[PDB]
Amino acid sequence: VPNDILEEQLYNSIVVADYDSAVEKSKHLYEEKKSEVITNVVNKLIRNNKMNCMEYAYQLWLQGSKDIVRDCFPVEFRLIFAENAIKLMYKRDGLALTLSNDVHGNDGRLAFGDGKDKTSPKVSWKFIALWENNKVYFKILNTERNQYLVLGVGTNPNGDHMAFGVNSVDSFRAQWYLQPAKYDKDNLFYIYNREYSKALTLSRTLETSGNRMAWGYNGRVIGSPEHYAWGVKAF
Ligand SMILES: [K+]
Numbered sequence: 001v002p003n004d005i006l007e008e009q010l011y012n013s014i015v016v017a018d019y020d021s022a023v024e025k026s027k028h029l030y031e032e033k034k035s036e037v038i039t040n041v042v043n044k045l046i047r048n049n050k051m052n053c054m055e056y057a058y059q060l061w062l063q064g065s066k067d068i069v070r071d072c073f074p075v076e077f078r079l080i081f082a083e084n085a086i087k088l089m090y091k092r093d094g095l096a097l098t099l100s101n102d103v104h105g106n107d108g109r110l111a112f113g114d115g116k117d118k119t120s121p122k123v124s125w126k127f128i129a130l131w132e133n134n135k136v137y138f139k140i141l142n143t144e145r146n147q148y149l150v151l152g153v154g155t156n157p158n159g160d161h162m163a164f165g166v167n168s169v170d171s172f173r174a175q176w177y178l179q180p181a182k183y184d185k186d187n188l189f190y191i192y193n194r195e196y197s198k199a200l201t202l203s204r205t206l207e208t209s210g211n212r213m214a215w216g217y218n219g220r221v222i223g224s225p226e227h228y229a230w231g232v233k234a235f
Contacts, residue, residue: 003034003036003037006025006029006034006037007037007040007041007044009025010022010025010026010029010037010038010041011041011044011045013025014041014045014050014052014053014055014056015050015052017052017055017134019055019056019059019134020059020063022056022059023059023060023063023065026038026060026065026068027065027068030065030067030068030071030072035068035071035072038068038072039072042072042073042074045180046074046180046181046182046187047182049179049180049181049190049222050179050180051177051178051179051180053180054136054177054178054179054180055134055135055136057069057073057077057080057081058081058129058131058136061081062131066081069081074180074187075234076187076189076231076232079232079233079234080127080129080138080178080232081127081129083126083127083128084126084234084235085124085125085126085143085234085235086124086125086126086127086232086233086234086235087118087123087124087125087232087233087234087235088125088140088191088230088231088232089118089230089231089232089233090113090201090202090212090230090231091183091186091188091225091226091227091228091229091230091231092202092226092227092228093113093202093212094118095113095114095115095118095202095211095212096113096114096117096118096119096123097111097112097113097114097123097125097149097214097230098111098112098113098114098117098122098123098142099111099112099122099142099144099145099147099165100112104164107152107162107164107166108147108150108164108165108166108167109145109147109164109165109166110162110163110164110165110213110214111149111162111163111164111165111213111214112202112207112211112212112213112214113202113211113212113213113214114211115206115207115209115210115211115212116209116210121143121144122144123235124142124143124144124235125140125141125142125143125149126140126141126143127139127140127141127232128140128141130175135177136177137175137176137177137194138175138176138177138178139169139174139175139176140176140191142165143235145165146167147165147166147167148165148166148167148168148169148174149163149164149165149174149176149200150163150164150165150166150173150174151163151164151173151193151195151196151198151216152164152173153173155218156215158218158219159218160198160215160216160217160218161193161196161198161215161216161218162213162214162215162216163200163213163214163215163216171195172193172194172195173193173194173195173196175193175194175195176191176192176193176194176200177191177192177194178190178191178192179192179222181225181229182225183225183226183229186231187231188225188229188230188231189229189230189232190221190222190225190228190229190230191230193216196216198216198217198218199216199217199221199228200214200215200216200217200230201214201215201216201217201221201228202214202215203215
């Protein structure tokens with residue numbers, strides 16, 4: 001079977017969310033030195049912002065094909081599924097996500113993009129995957145505080161939810177799903193909340209410190225990864 005047909009068949013299995021079929025087809029390709037077909041499929045999934053690319057990577061990771069994730073995907077997939085300490089860098093502003101020191105009552109610590117620190121232990125996070133009902137979700141754990149990223153129930157006048165770090169994962173407010181995207185050579189992700197299906201963003205409003213508060217944004221983000229998406233960098 002020609003490579004373009006193998007590409008087609010692999011890509012369709014992922015888009016319909018038959019991950020076991022996608023894993024099986026991938027294993028065959030990778031054994032037969034046709035990593036070009038897998039890489040081409042991943043690149044297409046990302047061009048097309050297909051969320052199912054995350055589940056595909058995760059099932060390869062779980063089903064004994066971590067080598068395929070390492071070798072055929074942007075480095076970010078490795079970083080996510082290996083639970084590497086990473087930095088979450090907002091493409092628009094080049095700021096690292098962090099948590100405040102003081103605890104804002106039952107809300108937890110405030111999440112924000114730090115105006116200055118893009119490098120200390122405060123800006124380290126890890127993604128912790130879980131599978132449910134044919135989807136992969138993530139808890140996003142701050143390394144220093146052992147607190148999880150969450151949206152609060154409250155909203156501003158736009159219907160945006162504030163983001164916080166809290167002690168445990170008690171509800172879908174503390175779980176997230178990812179959608180891949182591209183800007184130039186950089187692979188990015190929209191990061192959506194499971195409870196409210198809003199994208200994690202940084203405020204356009206600057207604090208005098210240069211900090212920007214983090215919010216679950218009530219608005220359109222797709223098509224504008226350079227405004228609303230996140231890079232994942234090795235810490
Ligand atoms: K073959």
